[PDB]
Amino acid sequence: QIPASEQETLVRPKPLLLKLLKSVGAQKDTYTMKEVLFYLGQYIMTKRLYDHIVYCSNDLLGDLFGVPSFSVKEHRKIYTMIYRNLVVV
């Protein structure tokens, strides 16, 4: 059910993820996970990979996550895919 505390986690995205974030406006070295989820979420809507599965097999999101798609309901899984592209602060 995940803890609310997780969204407060401070993180430094690796180069590729930092590249995705910068496309929806991000301009920081370090982010809170809340910011990361919001910016990735706008990356997903503005680019219609979602309308409850997200389709990214032909996008760098797909490259960063290592999957051609994923269910937006699987939060623990999404969290694990995101941490592979960042370092905690």
**Is 21 an interacting residue with respect to ligand 1MT (CB under 6 A)?**
no
- Cα–Cα distances (Å) from 1 to 6, 42, 74, 80, in that order, read 11, 23, 10, 15
Residues 45, 87, 88, 89: which binds ligand 1MT (CB under 6 A)? Answer: 45
Tokens, residue 29: 């070295």
**Is 50 an interacting residue with respect to ligand 1MT (CB under 6 A)?**
yes
CA dist 26 and 39 (Å) reads 7
What mask of x and - would describe binding to ligand 1MT in positions 54 to 83, judged by CB under 6 A?
A: x-----------------x--x--xx----
